[PDB]
Amino acid sequence: FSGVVDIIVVRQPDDSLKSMPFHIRFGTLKNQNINIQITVNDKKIEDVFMLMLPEGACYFPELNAKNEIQKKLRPSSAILKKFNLKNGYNKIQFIAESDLQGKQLIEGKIYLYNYDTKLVISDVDGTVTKSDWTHDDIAELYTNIQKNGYKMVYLSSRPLYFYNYTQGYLKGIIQNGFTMPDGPILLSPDQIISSEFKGALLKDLRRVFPEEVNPIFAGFGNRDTDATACLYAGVIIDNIFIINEQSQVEILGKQEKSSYKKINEKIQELFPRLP
């Protein structure tokens, strides 16, 4: 695999920035001599460079306090702030220059959120697809949720080799006139490498935000363990939706039977509008 896993960046109340781990790989790239540059929104970023591991995994070099270079997947606040990201979607490109192959470039997406930004979590397998075919009216409901100021965030525990297909599947979905709203796709840490896993992933997402806010407003899932992952991630039981293979979603807080078409009819009362 060669590509960029969607990156989430959150601006803190002290205007510092925190981010989730950078998962970028140059699989088809044929180690220590490789230097990696970054361009955000078609502009080159100076001072910021990444190194590559033998397998193709890339990291940010950062001295620690014992002056031992650390392999950090989360860039510093100063590095993230040289990106000069805009709020929402940003285009990021990683450029590896090799004497044997010239410069090789992978493109990805990096998202910037505020500490007060409200996220709506959705699973892909079983929640968008009908088994882990697409459930009906999910694109219209998700389009209206983004119109009300919420950010859709997708989760997938699929192998990293199928990450780019999952992006293609979600964005090729068309139900009536409504496309699927653009948002980051987070990958479970088991499918990646280190230099039930859904619950650990959501707390990395949560703890990127400050502790005193609950960033995840709602969550969509297919199994009862998805509900456990959202409850421990700060989501209230009223805002947890669980669907089966027969396209009936159950609101957990009130033990209420409903559907995507029914939740989209209650969009302003279940997802109040945010200016």
Q: Is 99 annotated as a binding residue?
A: no
Q: Is 84 annotated as a binding residue?
A: no
Q: Per CB under 5 A, does 137 bind Ca ion? A: no
Cα atoms found within 13 Å of the Cα of residue 219, Cβ hemisphere only: 30
| Nearest approach, Cβ of residue 1 and Ca ion (Å) | 22
Nearer to Ca ion, 184 or 221 (CB): 221
| Three-state secondary structure of 136-200 | CCHHHHHHHHHHCCCEEEEEECCCHHHHHHHHHHHHCCEECCEECCCCCEEECHHHCCCCCHHHH
Query: Which one of the spans 58-66, 207-215, 224-232, 264-272 is the region binding Ca ion (CB under 5 A)?
Result: 224-232
| Nearest approach, Cβ of residue 183 and Ca ion (Å) | 17
Nearer to Ca ion, 11 or 135 (CB): 135
Distance of alpha carbon 103 from alpha carbon 246, whole angstroms: 49
Nearer to Ca ion, 175 or 222 (CB): 222
Closest CA to 256 of 269, 266, 244, 241: 241
| Nearest approach, Cβ of residue 215 and Ca ion (Å) | 19
Query: Which one of the spans 18-26, 189-197, 199-207, 215-223 is the region binding Ca ion (CB under 5 A)?
Result: 215-223
Query: Which one of the spans 47-55, 134-142, 166-174, 226-234 is the region binding Ca ion (CB under 5 A)?
Result: 226-234
Q: Per CB under 5 A, does 226 bind Ca ion? A: yes
40, 44, 50, 55 alpha-carbon torsion, rounded to 10°: 70
Amino acid at 173: I
| Nearest approach, Cβ of residue 223 and Ca ion (Å) | 5
Quote the tokens at residue 230: 């959202």
Nearer to Ca ion, 80 or 124 (CB): 124
Nearer to Ca ion, 165 or 197 (CB): 197
Distance of alpha carbon 263 from alpha carbon 268, whole angstroms: 10
Provide the phi-psi class of 102: left if phi over 0, else alpha when psi is between -120 and 50, else beta: left
Q: Per CB under 5 A, does 123 bind Ca ion? A: yes
Q: Is 226 annotated as a binding residue?
A: yes
Distance of alpha carbon 229 from alpha carbon 125, whole angstroms: 15
Contact status, residue 217 vs residue 120, Cβ threshold 8 Å: yes
| Nearest approach, Cβ of residue 218 and Ca ion (Å) | 15
Q: Which residues would be at the binding site for Ca ion (CB under 5 A)?
A: 123, 221-223, 226
